[PDB]
Symmetry: C2
Subunit: 153 residues, 2 copies
């Protein structure tokens, strides 16, 4: 895996959204965009495109350490991310919440490639000695499990 992972600057707009964390909206409005409008426009390519959008997003919103993942996920409305395993070359998280529960109940196969790509890219941005990573998104009854593991280069 020969690639130098590095972050890049946010635009003025991208930086400005931090100031909107205190403005209240609702999860219906959120799903309307993320889980209706987007899949409607992207169709069969939605999964691969979200994966790479997750990596692209990581580059704009780089974090400094693994411990920061849960807070980012929660604030981003991606759900509650709990660590089940944290080993030298493997991370496993549970991800859940009312929006996710509704997806698991009513969608054939919910997609979490945005989240998977984001974590994979963050891990690489933080450590230039990481070669390639592999991600798994496993559906359970009331939650999903995100697993990212990797080799050293």
């Amino acid at each position: 895996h020969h690639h130098h992972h590095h972050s890049h600057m946010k635009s003025k707009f991208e930086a400005s959204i931090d100031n909107l964390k205190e403005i209240e909206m609702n999860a219906y409005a959120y799903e309307l965009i993320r889980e209706i409008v987007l899949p409607d426009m992207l169709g069969q390519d939605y999964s691969s495109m979200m994966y790479w959008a997750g990596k692209h997003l990581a580059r704009k919103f780089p974090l400094e350490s693994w411990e920061e993942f849960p807070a980012f996920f929660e604030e981003a409305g991606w759900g509650t991310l709990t660590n089940v395993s944290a080993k030298k070359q493997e991370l496993e998280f549970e991800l859940e919440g009312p929006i996710i529960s509704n997806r698991l109940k009513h969608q054939k196969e919910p997609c979490f490639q945005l989240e998977a790509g984001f974590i994979a890219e963050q891990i690489q941005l933080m450590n230039d000695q990481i070669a390639e990573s592999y991600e798994q998104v496993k559906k359970r009854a009331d939650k999903v499990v995100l697993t990212v593991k990797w080799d050293m280069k």
Copy 2:
């Protein structure tokens, strides 16, 4: 396109009372989404608005403001009703932040939604036109039919 929701699409109604902050919303709608729809973001979003309208039908245009508010699209006001036309203004804190920092804010989803709702109402060809007015901190959406 289609006027029937999937079971999941119908289910998001019971998320209307679940909280979500505006940062999370803008992260998906104004950062992730445009990066997946580059140059021709506008045609896609216009179509998507129509596609949405067909499965979220509204009986009258007087219902547009409530729909916009709940959908987090902003505060929509009808400001005129000239011959074969309706003019709306769209504004609010999230929109203001877009107008302040974005080179070319885009409201084609909203425009397509209004166009198709009207077309389904009167069975005549309708289209919507957008004008961002930074100096008045608002967007004007005008829908015309023939």
